[PDB]
Amino acid sequence: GSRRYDSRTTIFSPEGRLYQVEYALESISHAGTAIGIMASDGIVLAAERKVTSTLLEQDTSTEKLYKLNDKIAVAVAGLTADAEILINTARIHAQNYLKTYNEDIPVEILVRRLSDIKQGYTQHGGLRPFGVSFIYAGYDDRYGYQLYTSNPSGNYTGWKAISVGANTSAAQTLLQMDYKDDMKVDDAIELALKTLSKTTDSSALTYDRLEFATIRKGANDGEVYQKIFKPQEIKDILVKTGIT
Amino acid sequence: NNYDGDTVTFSPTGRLFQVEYALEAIKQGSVTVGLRSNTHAVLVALKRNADELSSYQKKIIKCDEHMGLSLAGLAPDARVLSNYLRQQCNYSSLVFNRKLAVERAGHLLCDKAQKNTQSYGGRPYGVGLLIIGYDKSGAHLLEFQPSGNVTELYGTAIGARSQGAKTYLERTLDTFIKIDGNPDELIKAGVEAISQSLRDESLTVDNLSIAIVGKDTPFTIYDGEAVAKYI
Amino acid sequence: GYDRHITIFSPEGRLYQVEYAFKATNQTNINSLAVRGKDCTVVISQKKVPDKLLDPTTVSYIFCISRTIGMVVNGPIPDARNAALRAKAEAAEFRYKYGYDMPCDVLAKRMANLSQIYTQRAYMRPLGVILTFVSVDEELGPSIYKTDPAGYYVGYKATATGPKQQEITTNLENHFKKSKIDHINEESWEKVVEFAITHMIDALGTEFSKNDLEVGVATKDKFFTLSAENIEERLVAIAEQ
Amino acid sequence: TSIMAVTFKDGVILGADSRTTTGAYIANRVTDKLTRVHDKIWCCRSGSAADTQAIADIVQYHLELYTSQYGTPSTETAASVFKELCYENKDNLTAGIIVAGYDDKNKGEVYTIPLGGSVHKLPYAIAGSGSTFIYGYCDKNFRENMSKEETVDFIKHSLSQAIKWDGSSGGVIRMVVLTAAGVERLIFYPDEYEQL
Amino acid sequence: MDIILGIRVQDSVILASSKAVTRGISVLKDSDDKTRQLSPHTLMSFAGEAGDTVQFAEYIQANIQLYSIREDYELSPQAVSSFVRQELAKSIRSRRPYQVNVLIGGYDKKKNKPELYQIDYLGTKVELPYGAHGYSGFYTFSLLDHHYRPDMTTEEGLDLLKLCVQELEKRMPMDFKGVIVKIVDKDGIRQVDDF
Amino acid sequence: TGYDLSNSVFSPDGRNFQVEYAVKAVENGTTSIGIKCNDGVVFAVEKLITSKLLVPQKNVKIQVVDRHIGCVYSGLIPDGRHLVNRGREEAASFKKLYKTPIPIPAFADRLGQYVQAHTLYNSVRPFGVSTIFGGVDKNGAHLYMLEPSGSYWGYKGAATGKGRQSAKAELEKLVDHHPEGLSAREAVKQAAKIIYLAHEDNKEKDFELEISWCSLSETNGLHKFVKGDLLQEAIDFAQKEIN
Amino acid sequence: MTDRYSFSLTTFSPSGKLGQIDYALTAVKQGVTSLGIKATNGVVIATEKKSSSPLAMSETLSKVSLLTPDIGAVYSGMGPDYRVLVDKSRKVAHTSYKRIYGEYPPTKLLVSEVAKIMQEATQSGGVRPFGVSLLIAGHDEFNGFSLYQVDPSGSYFPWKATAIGKGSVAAKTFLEKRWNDELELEDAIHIALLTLKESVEGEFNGDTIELAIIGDENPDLLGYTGIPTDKGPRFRKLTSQEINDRLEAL
Amino acid sequence: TTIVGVKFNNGVVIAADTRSTQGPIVADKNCAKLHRISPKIWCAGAGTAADTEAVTQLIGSNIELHSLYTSREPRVVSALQMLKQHLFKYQGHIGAYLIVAGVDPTGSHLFSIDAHGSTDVGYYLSLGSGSLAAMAVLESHWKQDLTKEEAIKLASDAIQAGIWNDLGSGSNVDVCVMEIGKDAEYLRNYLTPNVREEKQKSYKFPRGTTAVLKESIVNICDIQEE
Amino acid sequence: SDPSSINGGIVVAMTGKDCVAIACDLRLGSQSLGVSNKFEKIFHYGHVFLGITGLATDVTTLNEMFRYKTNLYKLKEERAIEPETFTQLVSSSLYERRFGPYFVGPVVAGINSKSGKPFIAGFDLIGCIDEAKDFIVSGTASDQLFGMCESLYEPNLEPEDLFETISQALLNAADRDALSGWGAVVYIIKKDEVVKRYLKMRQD
Ligand SMILES: [Cl-]
Ligand SMILES: [Mg+2]
Ligand SMILES: [Mg+2]
Numbered sequence A: 001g002s003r004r005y006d007s008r009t010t011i012f013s014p015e016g017r018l019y020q021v022e023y024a025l026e027s028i029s030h031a032g033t034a035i036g037i038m039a040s041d042g043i044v045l046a047a048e049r050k051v052t053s054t055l056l057e058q059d060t061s062t063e064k065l066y067k068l069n070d071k072i073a074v075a076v077a078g079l080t081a082d083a084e085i086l087i088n089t090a091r092i093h094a095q096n097y098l099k100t101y102n103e104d105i106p107v108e109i110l111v112r113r114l115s116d117i118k119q120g121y122t123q124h125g126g127l128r129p130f131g132v133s134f135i136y137a138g139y140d141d142r143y144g145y146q147l148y149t150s151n152p153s154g155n156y157t158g159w160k161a162i163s164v165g166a167n168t169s170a171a172q173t174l175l176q177m178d179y180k181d182d183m184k185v186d187d188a189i190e191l192a193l194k195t196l197s198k199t200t201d202s203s204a205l206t207y208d209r210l211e212f213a214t215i216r217k218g219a220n221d222g223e224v225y226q227k228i229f230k231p232q233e234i235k236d237i238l239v240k241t242g243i244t
Numbered sequence B: 001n002n003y004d005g006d007t008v009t010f011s012p013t014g015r016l017f018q019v020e021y022a023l024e025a026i027k028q029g030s031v032t033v034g035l036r037s038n039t040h041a042v043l044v045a046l047k048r049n050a051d052e053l054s055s056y057q058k059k060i061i062k063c064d065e066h067m068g069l070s071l072a073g074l075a076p077d078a079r080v081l082s083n084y085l086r087q088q089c090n091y092s093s094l095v096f097n098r099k100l101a102v103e104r105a106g107h108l109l110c111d112k113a114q115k116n117t118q119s120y121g122g123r124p125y126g127v128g129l130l131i132i133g134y135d136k137s138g139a140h141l142l143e144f145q146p147s148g149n150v151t152e153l154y155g156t157a158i159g160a161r162s163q164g165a166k167t168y169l170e171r172t173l174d175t176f177i178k179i180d181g182n183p184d185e186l187i188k189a190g191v192e193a194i195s196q197s198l199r200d201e202s203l204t205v206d207n208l209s210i211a212i213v214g215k216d217t218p219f220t221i222y223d224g225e226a227v228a229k230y231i
Numbered sequence C: 001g002y003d004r005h006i007t008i009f010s011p012e013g014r015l016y017q018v019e020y021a022f023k024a025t026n027q028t029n030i031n032s033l034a035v036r037g038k039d040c041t042v043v044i045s046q047k048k049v050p051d052k053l054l055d056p057t058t059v060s061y062i063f064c065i066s067r068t069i070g071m072v073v074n075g076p077i078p079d080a081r082n083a084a085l086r087a088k089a090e091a092a093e094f095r096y097k098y099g100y101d102m103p104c105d106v107l108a109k110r111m112a113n114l115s116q117i118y119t120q121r122a123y124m125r126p127l128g129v130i131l132t133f134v135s136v137d138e139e140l141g142p143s144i145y146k147t148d149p150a151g152y153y154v155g156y157k158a159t160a161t162g163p164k165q166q167e168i169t170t171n172l173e174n175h176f177k178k179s180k181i182d183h184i185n186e187e188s189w190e191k192v193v194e195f196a197i198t199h200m201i202d203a204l205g206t207e208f209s210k211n212d213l214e215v216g217v218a219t220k221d222k223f224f225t226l227s228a229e230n231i232e233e234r235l236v237a238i239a240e241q
Numbered sequence D: 001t002s003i004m005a006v007t008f009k010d011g012v013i014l015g016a017d018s019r020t021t022t023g024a025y026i027a028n029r030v031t032d033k034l035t036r037v038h039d040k041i042w043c044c045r046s047g048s049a050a051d052t053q054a055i056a057d058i059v060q061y062h063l064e065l066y067t068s069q070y071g072t073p074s075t076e077t078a079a080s081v082f083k084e085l086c087y088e089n090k091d092n093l094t095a096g097i098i099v100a101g102y103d104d105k106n107k108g109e110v111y112t113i114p115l116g117g118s119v120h121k122l123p124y125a126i127a128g129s130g131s132t133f134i135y136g137y138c139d140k141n142f143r144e145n146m147s148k149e150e151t152v153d154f155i156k157h158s159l160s161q162a163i164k165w166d167g168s169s170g171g172v173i174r175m176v177v178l179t180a181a182g183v184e185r186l187i188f189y190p191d192e193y194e195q196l
Numbered sequence E: 001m002d003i004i005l006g007i008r009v010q011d012s013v014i015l016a017s018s019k020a021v022t023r024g025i026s027v028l029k030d031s032d033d034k035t036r037q038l039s040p041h042t043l044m045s046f047a048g049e050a051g052d053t054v055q056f057a058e059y060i061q062a063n064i065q066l067y068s069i070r071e072d073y074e075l076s077p078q079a080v081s082s083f084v085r086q087e088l089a090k091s092i093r094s095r096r097p098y099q100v101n102v103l104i105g106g107y108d109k110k111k112n113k114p115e116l117y118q119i120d121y122l123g124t125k126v127e128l129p130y131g132a133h134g135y136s137g138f139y140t141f142s143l144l145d146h147h148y149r150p151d152m153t154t155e156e157g158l159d160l161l162k163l164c165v166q167e168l169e170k171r172m173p174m175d176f177k178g179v180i181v182k183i184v185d186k187d188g189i190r191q192v193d194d195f
Numbered sequence F: 001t002g003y004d005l006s007n008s009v010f011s012p013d014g015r016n017f018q019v020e021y022a023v024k025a026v027e028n029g030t031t032s033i034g035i036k037c038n039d040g041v042v043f044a045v046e047k048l049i050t051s052k053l054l055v056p057q058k059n060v061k062i063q064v065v066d067r068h069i070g071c072v073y074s075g076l077i078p079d080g081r082h083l084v085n086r087g088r089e090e091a092a093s094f095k096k097l098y099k100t101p102i103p104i105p106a107f108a109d110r111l112g113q114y115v116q117a118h119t120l121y122n123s124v125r126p127f128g129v130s131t132i133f134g135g136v137d138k139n140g141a142h143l144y145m146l147e148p149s150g151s152y153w154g155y156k157g158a159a160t161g162k163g164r165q166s167a168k169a170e171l172e173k174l175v176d177h178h179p180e181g182l183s184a185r186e187a188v189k190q191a192a193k194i195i196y197l198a199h200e201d202n203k204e205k206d207f208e209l210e211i212s213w214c215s216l217s218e219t220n221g222l223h224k225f226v227k228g229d230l231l232q233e234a235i236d237f238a239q240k241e242i243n
Numbered sequence G: 001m002t003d004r005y006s007f008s009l010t011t012f013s014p015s016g017k018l019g020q021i022d023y024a025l026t027a028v029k030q031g032v033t034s035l036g037i038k039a040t041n042g043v044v045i046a047t048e049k050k051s052s053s054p055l056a057m058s059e060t061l062s063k064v065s066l067l068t069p070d071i072g073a074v075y076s077g078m079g080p081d082y083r084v085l086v087d088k089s090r091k092v093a094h095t096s097y098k099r100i101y102g103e104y105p106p107t108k109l110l111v112s113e114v115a116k117i118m119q120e121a122t123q124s125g126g127v128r129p130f131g132v133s134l135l136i137a138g139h140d141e142f143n144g145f146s147l148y149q150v151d152p153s154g155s156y157f158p159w160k161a162t163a164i165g166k167g168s169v170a171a172k173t174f175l176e177k178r179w180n181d182e183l184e185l186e187d188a189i190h191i192a193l194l195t196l197k198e199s200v201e202g203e204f205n206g207d208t209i210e211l212a213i214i215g216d217e218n219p220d221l222l223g224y225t226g227i228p229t230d231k232g233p234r235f236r237k238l239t240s241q242e243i244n245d246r247l248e249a250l
Numbered sequence H: 001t002t003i004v005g006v007k008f009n010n011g012v013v014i015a016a017d018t019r020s021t022q023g024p025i026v027a028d029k030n031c032a033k034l035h036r037i038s039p040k041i042w043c044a045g046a047g048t049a050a051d052t053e054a055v056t057q058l059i060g061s062n063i064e065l066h067s068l069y070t071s072r073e074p075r076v077v078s079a080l081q082m083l084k085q086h087l088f089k090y091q092g093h094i095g096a097y098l099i100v101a102g103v104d105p106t107g108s109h110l111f112s113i114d115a116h117g118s119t120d121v122g123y124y125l126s127l128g129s130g131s132l133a134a135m136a137v138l139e140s141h142w143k144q145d146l147t148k149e150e151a152i153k154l155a156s157d158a159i160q161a162g163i164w165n166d167l168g169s170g171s172n173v174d175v176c177v178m179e180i181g182k183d184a185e186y187l188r189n190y191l192t193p194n195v196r197e198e199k200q201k202s203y204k205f206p207r208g209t210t211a212v213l214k215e216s217i218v219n220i221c222d223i224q225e226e
Numbered sequence I: 001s002d003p004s005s006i007n008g009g010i011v012v013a014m015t016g017k018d019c020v021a022i023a024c025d026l027r028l029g030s031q032s033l034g035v036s037n038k039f040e041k042i043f044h045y046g047h048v049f050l051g052i053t054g055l056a057t058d059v060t061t062l063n064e065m066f067r068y069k070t071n072l073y074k075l076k077e078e079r080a081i082e083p084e085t086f087t088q089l090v091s092s093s094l095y096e097r098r099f100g101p102y103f104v105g106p107v108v109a110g111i112n113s114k115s116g117k118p119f120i121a122g123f124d125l126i127g128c129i130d131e132a133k134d135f136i137v138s139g140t141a142s143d144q145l146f147g148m149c150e151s152l153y154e155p156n157l158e159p160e161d162l163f164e165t166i167s168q169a170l171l172n173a174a175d176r177d178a179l180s181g182w183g184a185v186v187y188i189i190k191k192d193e194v195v196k197r198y199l200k201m202r203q204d
């Protein structure tokens, strides 16, 4: 019958590894690099679009940076279509929590929920896992500014600075070298762009190949503002930091 | 070979190997004999033990006051099929106030076994059954195969070395069919029939199992010292 | 190589099970033809009864789907009757739900969508048949719409199906290149049937008796099949000029 | 409602009034209660207009699908399909239907299906609120094997009386004739049938 | 059950609940505690139909305790009250609704403020300086409307509460066998054992 | 290759090999036939006597559907019983809704669609039987034969099983020598002869003959088994022709 | 029976490739060329009507389809897969938007819904991916004119101009040289016809070319008058004659 | 509510009053009761106002999808069949009473529909609380072979009878004309015979008349930058 | 017993020259018993304002539901919902509970950010839209509000004049209803400024 054609997506190898998870991680290593850096006064998200065209409408385009709510955003590395399925689920979870408790969802609770959904596809159902790694940038009043990552296994961890996608080994070494705990957002903006500029597979880093976002308490008094940078604004910050 | 992985696959010569392998389980089972006259129907079964400390595996199951069977092969499969027969005999009595005809019981067993030979995921039954009974048309003996094939006979045998008993019954056909109104002589003929299938071992008091049903005789099973009279 | 057993893509972006279903289509070794008149649509098909023990009246590949729609099938009879039963059920349901007779082109689309599903879902196999639907539609007039195992469908001025479809197709093409119109300019359906049989004789290079053919005719508000004696009258008229 | 169907020598004729009421208000004075479920199988509807229209539409669908598979259905078969719907949904329906049809083998046949969903084959049938007033007249005047003209007169006179006494019935008398020759619609206006 | 009262003062919330349980003809118990601790700084008193009251209260308690363990964090009184409201608003359109009215008294450790929420079985929530359910408010609100100040001490709140209970004992037809009084503040929940 | 390991898979030819393998099981079975006569149909089957211990006349093979349809089959007997059980459900639901007993062409398609459905999926196996069936309805006598593929046609005469070639040749002679038609009683005699003649392909073991018929004049359009004197008369006629 | 294929037929290979998606893209590559160009006051989508037989009436086969009054779609790849996706896209525009908000969805969100359907055929049990790439052009009040490409994986991208299928690589280079941000709709149609001529072998006329625009509101195609706020569809399919008129000024 | 439908030479016209009520209170004085199912199929609804609007939009939505699927302009009989089967299934609980009219490739059509699922055919129809007043006018002035101008006149006169004589109806007359081979013309407020007279007095208050406790700016803007 | 008059309360909305106003009382009660004088019945999602009268549990539930839905709308659409669009969403959401409805009387008020056009709308408990040019009323004193608005209202009132008109309409209507009062709020809404004013009124 049908058993003949079953790939068995949820089995261990003899070494105790999950085949499909490992192969999905291999897929993600070819995706454009995304970086997150956490500072005392905010968080930076920077990400590289994959080899673009001059005829691509950039100002209406979104492939890397997504808003989950007013306090939490994500950077994507992997299959964009897979990511949008999970992103929509996460947006719904955040609203479910807000309706139930009348408070904004704490960052970790949202991260744990999405990560549990990823885990399920590795243990039951016989379906392929989601080929996506997320960087979560967010703020709540318990832990303040937070960075997390999750991968197709459904495992998640917290970070001061982290990269996903292509050249993460090189990127992580550069971040580990220049990162300091008392760093500020404007310094973190510069570090993120400098790291992408050195790790990129492209010839030069220009505005049309980048997506950028900041989460600042640089919002008038005790509140948080998300800023998804416009193409012209990415062009200006590239000149300011002296990359173009 | 490449066509024996499941029951849903014919071979190039039109064979169903999973069904044939299920048939093989019956041949490994212990011998059991069935025979009838015009007044009575008898089952004789050689029970098998695991070792000298163990009991002898029961072979005969009562289905109703007027019907029962003996098994050879996977015993749990006989329990499933006999339970189904008990229910069907029971449905007939409760709904129609009618004792289930032995022939109709054979048809129901055939259809239940067939469904397990044409669908994916399932497996054939691994047991053969000899059903005896007395209904409105007299004494009856049936042979069930897990292929679905059910056959009405004067006498037969299934299990290991069953060919010896089957040849004896084929010779004695004209004699034992005439044993009317004499239960003891019909059992004697059945005990003599099953003896043609024995090697190295003989019929002892905890080895032998006999069942009988007839005109004024409810289906009853004899074990222990109740069969010493026939040893 | 299990990409050849179920309907998934091969490395070339092909669906082999769909391609092999197209090959099953010619297993009966029968050719069919359809043309449009002014007021009618005619479909003819070869009839072969190879066994003397057969009842020839039951051997047929033309189906009356509804009062207005007829369907000829190229492919094995089990898959043909499967498609026929479903088309009949769909046509009847349509009339019940939407209050008017299902158009020929709409039924074709529906059956084509069902076929498309078999090419995408693994547990279902394609049907090894090509379905030619004919009618005189109340809005579009004479109509020929043909469906295949890939889920493709389109309207036709005229069409042909079977092992020798190309010979018939080219013959029909050449006629319409001369006349420069999209139909047979004839008043009566009898003469449109005569045109259809004549051009099949020309294309295949074979003569036909009354038992060698099978004919279906669609007019306004009804589709019907001709008897052997109705076909004989048609053959006599062809021979007499 | 005043509805009836009558078998005669050449086939069967269905008859009906045209009045539909909501209490004492006549919601439609020119209603067509004679309904086609197949070419030569028609029915007369009485009871809830929603129910009988819903039933007749389902039957028409069933017989259209029957025809595509098995050819022309018998009048008995059409009556059976009506019965199945009326019997199995008796709790939720208020429908009294008379089924009339013409075969060539069986000729004219009439089946009546009252409230409970039972079937009764009859030489002629009457139903609706107005039928109560013409049980006497119809029983005295019906003969088997009447001519077309005699049967038209019998129905015209019968429904005339039903209309005269039943406030729920009125308007025009519609009729449908079912024979080998085909299907003929007839209509008779108040100025004609009131002076009978 | 019968009378449940609440009052939010300067630095604490005080809940008072009757002790009687009546099975129609007889008073079966005169020491019943109509309250459940949901978290270290959140208390819920309840009244309504028999069985459903305790079943609902313990169900809520289990859920809040589950949240506390999962997150290693105590939900704010506002968040707990919203969760409870939703459960009752869900319940009112169920096959058989919870016939339970509650008061939620909590001390918010983040804002350093006491908070009192009144929720009825329909899922009707209001935040109040003082509240009640049933007929309790009909007898006590005129006294609370007169004497209440937002800057009252806990001792002044207890005294105003005594005046409310005295008026209930005078004008109510039912004998509710006194009240158990509990205080919710920055240090948690405690019971006043002499009232 | 591998196209023959799973049902419903098209080979590069456009063939379903699993259905073709089911035909091999049919060809391995005993001979069964059907003859269409003037006002009805006759069915006959070869029953191999494997042993003396088989009770004569007891293991009945031909099956009735409703009261007017007979069914016989060659191949896997349980598969045939499963198909007849479905046929009995189809006939019951038809009569329930439409009142009239199911017409034979209508019944033929019900079996056809069901057998065809077992060629659409790999989760089921095709039927290992060819079924000869028919009876009398309002339009007269009808005889059908249905294959594992779901394919069926109407027949003047039909045969299947191990001795089908022999039987077919005998049936073809009857069609040629009787264009006007055959009577029901003649058809019973001829059916006996053809089974006896077809038994040459199964000559090792002896057999038991079983005949049934539906005729407008002889059985009032109901299916009945040929028994007693009429069966013996047919056996005598058959034995006379082989000698 | 029952669908017993409850497992994924698309899985990751050791190299991280999703084979079935790659193979679906290969099927799209074999497909007939289709393109889209965005102007300041409109959008144009175009393709070749590759007729399978001259006896076939190619007007009965619509490669360019109306999804909403202000949104249209064209494809390259497997035609039948496209046809069912158009059916699903038309329905989802109503069920998940118009029946909720009382208005037609904006282009980007309808594209998002179609993308989701294509993504699910890449992960759900017992199905293969859709073998098509779509180009979807549309207009809505707050986003203006827009053009999107949707691939078998479910991924979608906005374009100023692009091409998919057979001769897409050459066509995209041709479009890069001609496109600017000051093009009027008539200029974009002209460029579309020029670009499409390069990938067409045989006849090149109004009967072999299918072309539609998203432009001004067409009150003449509304079918009713009396409601000032309803001004008609922005989607319009050009006629055979209208295409031929612009082929003389070519 | 008063709604009518009238057939004429080359098409069909429907009309309605513009008053919607909640018991004896007028909720809206200029209500729109003429609903569009498709460009050339319009219906007018009486009964539960949410139901008539909801059932019209559902069937209108499904009619649009059907039209796209079949590449044909929608038919009135399709709208009728879909509406009656939907309403029958809900056994009268969906309280929609409709007059459905339109033109299609088959011709011009006029039907009515009761909440329980029954339909009828006619040359002139009326529904709603003012249907008896309207039907009185229709039965007095209807004839065969009416012109477009005569049918509009008759339809609006029938609505006026409902406006003046039925307390459930009032305000203005809305009309929609559907002619074969033409665009359907929706004539909103075709007649306006109920304008309120000028009041005797102005009730504009002096500024500062109302006592105020607190004032504050409401932040409707999103969280700001910097 | 009647769910729509257990808790009491009223909402009124009006249009003016380049502005809209929406107002409500502050009472929540259990029939005769006054429970709260701070129960505001007007909410806003971006620049769109929603007033809701009726059963208080459903008032709270629907606010939470429309906050839920308008937040998801904004994330997907990348813009704030408009009054016309939100009106359809309210109608759709209410009708989905056709045979088990929320016992409420919603009122929408706002200015379209692109056209600048003032907009108001009202609904029955099951979704029927009343889109009036002049004014919308809702609640246990809707009869009284209809009487006030019909005489006090005139078109094209300036923002500060509209405030006086709607305030006097609410106050005097509430004082003739036992289940309305205990305070009041008035929102004056212009294209890019909104002023909120609490009114002084009798507390019985
Ligand atoms: Cl479809
Ligand atoms: Mg498949
Ligand atoms: Mg009368």
Ligand SMILES: [Mg+2]
Pocket (backbone or CB within 6 Å): I174, I175, I176, I177, I178, I179, I180, I181, I204
């Ligand atoms: Mg008051």
Ligand SMILES: [Mg+2]
Pocket (backbone or CB within 6 Å): I204
């Ligand atoms: Mg008072």
